Amino acid sequence: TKPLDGINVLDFTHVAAGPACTQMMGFLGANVIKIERRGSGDMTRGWLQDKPNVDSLYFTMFNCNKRSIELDMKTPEGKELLEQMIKKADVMVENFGPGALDRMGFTWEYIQELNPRVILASVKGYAEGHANEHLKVYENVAQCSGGAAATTGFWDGPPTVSGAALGDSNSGMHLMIGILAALEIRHKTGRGQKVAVAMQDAVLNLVRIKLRDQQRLERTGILAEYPQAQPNFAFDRDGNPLSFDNITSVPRGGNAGGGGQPGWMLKCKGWETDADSYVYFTIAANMWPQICDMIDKPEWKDDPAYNTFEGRVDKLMDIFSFIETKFADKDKFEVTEWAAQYGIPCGPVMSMKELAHDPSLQKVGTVVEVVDEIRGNHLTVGAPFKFSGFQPEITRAPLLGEHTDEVLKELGLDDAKIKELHAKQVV
Amino acid sequence: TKPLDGINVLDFTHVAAGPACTQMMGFLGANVIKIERRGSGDMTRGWLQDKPNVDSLYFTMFNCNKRSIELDMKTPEGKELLEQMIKKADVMVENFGPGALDRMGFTWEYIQELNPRVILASVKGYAEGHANEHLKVYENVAQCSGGAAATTGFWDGPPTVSGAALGDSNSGMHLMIGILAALEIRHKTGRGQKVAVAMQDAVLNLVRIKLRDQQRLERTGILAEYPQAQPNFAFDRDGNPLSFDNITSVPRGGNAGGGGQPGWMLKCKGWETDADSYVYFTIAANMWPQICDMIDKPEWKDDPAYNTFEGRVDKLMDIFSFIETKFADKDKFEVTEWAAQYGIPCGPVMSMKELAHDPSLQKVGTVVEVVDEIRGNHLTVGAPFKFSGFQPEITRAPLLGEHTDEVLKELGLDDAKIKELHAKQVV
Ligand SMILES: *SCCNC(=O)CCNC(=O)[C@H](O)C(C)(C)COP(=O)(O)OP(=O)(O)OC[C@H]1O[C@@H](n2cnc3c(N)ncnc32)[C@H](O)[C@@H]1OP(=O)(O)O
Ligand SMILES: *SCCNC(=O)CCNC(=O)[C@H](O)C(C)(C)COP(=O)(O)OP(=O)(O)OC[C@H]1O[C@@H](n2cnc3c(N)ncnc32)[C@H](O)[C@@H]1OP(=O)(O)O
Ligand SMILES: O=C([O-])C(=O)[O-]
Ligand SMILES: [Cl-]
Numbered sequence: 001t002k003p004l005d006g007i008n009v010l011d012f013t014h015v016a017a018g019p020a021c022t023q024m025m026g027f028l029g030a031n032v033i034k035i036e037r038r039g040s041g042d043m044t045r046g047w048l049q050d051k052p053n054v055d056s057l058y059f060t061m062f063n064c065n066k067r068s069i070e071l072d073m074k075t076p077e078g079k080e081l082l083e084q085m086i087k088k089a090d091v092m093v094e095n096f097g098p099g100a101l102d103r104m105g106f107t108w109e110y111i112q113e114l115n116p117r118v119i120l121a122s123v124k125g126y127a128e129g130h131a132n133e134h135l136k137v138y139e140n141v142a143q144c145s146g147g148a149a150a151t152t153g154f155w156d157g158p159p160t161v162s163g164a165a166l167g168d169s170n171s172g173m174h175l176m177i178g179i180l181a182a183l184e185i186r187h188k189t190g191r192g193q194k195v196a197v198a199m200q201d202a203v204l205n206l207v208r209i210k211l212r213d214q215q216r217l218e219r220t221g222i223l224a225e226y227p228q229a230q231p232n233f234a235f236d237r238d239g240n241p242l243s244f245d246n247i248t249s250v251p252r253g254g255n256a257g258g259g260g261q262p263g264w265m266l267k268c269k270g271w272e273t274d275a276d277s278y279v280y281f282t283i284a285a286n287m288w289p290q291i292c293d294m295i296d297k298p299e300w301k302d303d304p305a306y307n308t309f310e311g312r313v314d315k316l317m318d319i320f321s322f323i324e325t326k327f328a329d330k331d332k333f334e335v336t337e338w339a340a341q342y343g344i345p346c347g348p349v350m351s352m353k354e355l356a357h358d359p360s361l362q363k364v365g366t367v368v369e370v371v372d373e374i375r376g377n378h379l380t381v382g383a384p385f386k387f388s389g390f391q392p393e394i395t396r397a398p399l400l401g402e403h404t405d406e407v408l409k410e411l412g413l414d415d416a417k418i419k420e421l422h423a424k425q426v427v
Numbered sequence: 428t429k430p431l432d433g434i435n436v437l438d439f440t441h442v443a444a445g446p447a448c449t450q451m452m453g454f455l456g457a458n459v460i461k462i463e464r465r466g467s468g469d470m471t472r473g474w475l476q477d478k479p480n481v482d483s484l485y486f487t488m489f490n491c492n493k494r495s496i497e498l499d500m501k502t503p504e505g506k507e508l509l510e511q512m513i514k515k516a517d518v519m520v521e522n523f524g525p526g527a528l529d530r531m532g533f534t535w536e537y538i539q540e541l542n543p544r545v546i547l548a549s550v551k552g553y554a555e556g557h558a559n560e561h562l563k564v565y566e567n568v569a570q571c572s573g574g575a576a577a578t579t580g581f582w583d584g585p586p587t588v589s590g591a592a593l594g595d596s597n598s599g600m601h602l603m604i605g606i607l608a609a610l611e612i613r614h615k616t617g618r619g620q621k622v623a624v625a626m627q628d629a630v631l632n633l634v635r636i637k638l639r640d641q642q643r644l645e646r647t648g649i650l651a652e653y654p655q656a657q658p659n660f661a662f663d664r665d666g667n668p669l670s671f672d673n674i675t676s677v678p679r680g681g682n683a684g685g686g687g688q689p690g691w692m693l694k695c696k697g698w699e700t701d702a703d704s705y706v707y708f709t710i711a712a713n714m715w716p717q718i719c720d721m722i723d724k725p726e727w728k729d730d731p732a733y734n735t736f737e738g739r740v741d742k743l744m745d746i747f748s749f750i751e752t753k754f755a756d757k758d759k760f761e762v763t764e765w766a767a768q769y770g771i772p773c774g775p776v777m778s779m780k781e782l783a784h785d786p787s788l789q790k791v792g793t794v795v796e797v798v799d800e801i802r803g804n805h806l807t808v809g810a811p812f813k814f815s816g817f818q819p820e821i822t823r824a825p826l827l828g829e830h831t832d833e834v835l836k837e838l839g840l841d842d843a844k845i846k847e848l849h850a851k852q853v854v
């Protein structure tokens with residue numbers, strides 16, 4: 001049916017990393033119960049609101065397919081309700097600060113006692129055992145810790161944060177792998193396990209190519225395909241040349257390919273007044289004769305100075321800027337169309353507005369309009385993985401404490417004692 | 428014991444997205460057999476080599492914990508062998524061009540017939556159903572398609588690619604989620620499924636927050652926390668201050684926080700000569716009194732225009748520029764120390780050099796030294812998820828066709844059958 005039908009998730013998560021994880025689990029069928037702080041709830045509810053006193057898109061786009069119960073966990077009644085909820089859980093997920101769940105009495109060893117089958121899943125800034133394991137980390141600090149900021153941006157500019165969430169959402173997706181892997185062994189062992197993902201580690205995983213380049217740099221003293229190795233091309237703020245005779249750590253490469261097939265961000269008609277009027281253009285080696293046809297340079301097919309990676313490696317930026325002259329009267333889509341004819345790897349910079357309203361993305365269920373008959377409908381990113389056997393069924397994000405009574409009734413409590421919980425301000 | 432012990436993976440993958448997926452499965456215990464092209468194999472082998480005739484770091488860092496068999500798939504004998512291996516496998520992973528696996532005999536339907544239990548998993552550039560479904564895509568082409576490039580970099584500069592592999596390694600990790608979930612649902616149904624991740628979609632999932640902001644911008648006309656909403660701070664092509672008056676698609680915010688928690692990338696001692704001499708300084712909501720003690724300005728603790736987020740939103744760049752001048756005489760670790768005592772979300776930009784040789788990442792198994800007796804030892808990224816019950820054991824990447832005979836013998840083929848295949852140039 002759905003892969004995670006019948007998986008009960010006890011969801012302590014707030015902000016983006018942990019909530020990304022449990023939402024996606026909900027999309028694949030999981031029964032997700034989100035524990036929130038009394039009164040305020042998850043911080044994302046009040047962050048970046050578009051309508052005063054309505055849960056922000058920060059919350060709703062990260063908390064569909066969930067039920068909400070308010071709970072003070074620093075109370076003896078709270079800790080007992082938790083213990084019951086743990087015993088009915090398949091997976092516990094949390095992204096509090098280091099040691100926070102521990103100080104609430106819920107260490108991994110006490111969890112194993114409560115439920116031998118329950119998996120504990122954590123997001124933390126740094127890994128257990130790291131000198132920095134006790135630090136609290138948000139999105140951009142995480143990008144800085146993992147090598148991404150150092151290797152993103154231009155050579156004459158600062159380290160640059162990525163708009164893609166390398167810290168939060170990426171750690172949550174990585175945590176989902178750990179959880180599903182724990183489920184795979186549990187079928188063998190009949191036991192739960194602790195799984196943790198550090199935000200620094202998740203970033204380092206996406207920056208595997210830069211660790212490749214660090215070693216290449218150490219071993220050979222040069223990265224020939226980098227802009228800093230191109231003849232008289234890269235310079236710092238004072239006009240000093242930037243070259244590898246001076247570079248001991250992977251530099252920022254601007255819009256360079258990043259791997260074995262050179263590329264660049266090329267202006268298309270309208271770039272002066274439209275921030276996204278660009279294509280990315282890749283010189284794939286198997287594609288060079290086709291590139292020569294497209295740009296009307298037949299003399300470049302048989303020239304050893306042009307017809308191999310090695311020959312072009314000292315003239316990359318010359319070739320890119322000449323190719324770019326061909327795009328001056330064409331918008332990004334017609335350039336993309338034109339290259340597509342030759343089979344050349346080329347594509348548009350898609351604007352957020354263009355993606356938000358693209359028919360193909362809605363048709364495939366990657367951009368989903370959520371039916372929210374309380375707040376009004378909104379877009380979300382759906383499941384990025386498509387399956388032959390099932391489609392996700394995305395339902396609206398809960399109001400704060402909307403399923404508190406519904407959830408307490410599922411624990412076999414009666415109307416009288418649940419009123420005591422509201423009275424004692426535990427719920 | 429490891430989660431994926433006894434899971435058999437028939438691995439068609441090449442380049443980066445697919446190999447990352449299968450390597451990481453191999454790290455979790457899976458038996459990975461990699462089909463490669465005769466003579467040249469996976470194209471990463473001869474890309475960005477540091478030594479002539481030695482498999483590159485591009486190949487070894489994406490291909491540990493795998494065996495190699497050479498195979499010409501478009502021969503009758505190749506298709507015959509492929510059919511035998513499909514019946515042994517639990518998971519088939521591929522990232523060929525659109526329809527390429529179909530064209531050599533093996534459609535999803537034909538695969539089901541061969542093995543009702545096998546899961547087909549694919550990385551594509553665009554989702555099946557998409558208008559751009561036909562397009563072959565590389566790393567940065569996907570980053571542009573998925574909205575990352577449009578929202579990364581500066582307002583006065585071009586769309587900017589991320590050093591992090593949002594297209595390749597990220598889609599591969601997303602595909603691993605899809606495979607594992609298909610393994611969960613196979614415990615019920617007793618049948619395999621087809622699963623696919625589009626590179627555009629994996630990129631989009633990490634820019635969920637930018638789709639949040641797109642709706643915020645369409646709904647309200649402004650994004651208050653963005654630099655373009657700051658009084659006389661950012662400027663345009665000629666000199667005019669920017670505003671959201673004429674911005675209808677999510678813009679580039681430079682080093683802005685990207686969320687409800689503000690931030691900026693601040694210079695440290697030696698920034699002129701060291702590109703990574705920087706910290707990121709976040710201003711969390713509750714952590715405000717801690718910050719006021721450091722800046723040598725206790726005026727802001729009571730000041731109505733400084734103690735609220737709605738009060739701070741109109742002078743964000745005034746505060747960041749001043750606290751930068753304090754850091755002029757301290758390096759990035761001293762600045763982070765000067766702030767860790769307050770639990771302030773400040774962190775250093777870590778260089779690739781620092782990360783490759785950091786003691787903590789090695790201790791926790793995130794940067795791993797692979798024992799490679801053929802080529803020499805190299806570094807790699809290990810498993811970014813940490814488990815209580817096991818630890819990955821990372822073994823060197825195979826030589827081309829290193830295991831061909833060994834793999835062929837496992838299918839019960841005699842020495843004569845093997846030598847016939849070598850002579851006929853099938854293997
Ligand atoms: S997506 C980017 C966010 N980063 C991460 O997910 C990385 C891991 N998380 C963290 O480092 C922090 O949790 C972040 C998200 C940075 C936020 O830090 P805060 O300091 O604002 O919040 P904490 O999680 O550290 O929680 C503080 C204390 O409050 C207690 N608490 C939470 N919820 C409840 C409820 N419902 N009832 C009672 N107490 C509750 C936490 O246990 C924590 O306890 P302490 O003992 O005081 O630390
Ligand atoms: S980091 C992520 C990179 N990109 C992706 O993973 C996205 C999906 N893959 C692709 O878009 C392409 O595979 C890319 C990476 C762009 C490479 O393009 P190629 O020009 O190399 O095209 P193919 O990889 O699909 O290969 C071309 C033909 O060769 C056949 N083939 C592969 N391997 C063999 C072996 N061993 N034996 C015989 N034939 C083989 C493919 O089936 C394909 O067939 P055609 O029918 O000719 O297209
Ligand atoms: O990064 C890439 O994909 C490249 O360079 O081809
Ligand atoms: Cl996020």
Ligand SMILES: [Cl-]
Pocket residue numbers: 208209443444447592595596597
């Ligand atoms: Cl990659």
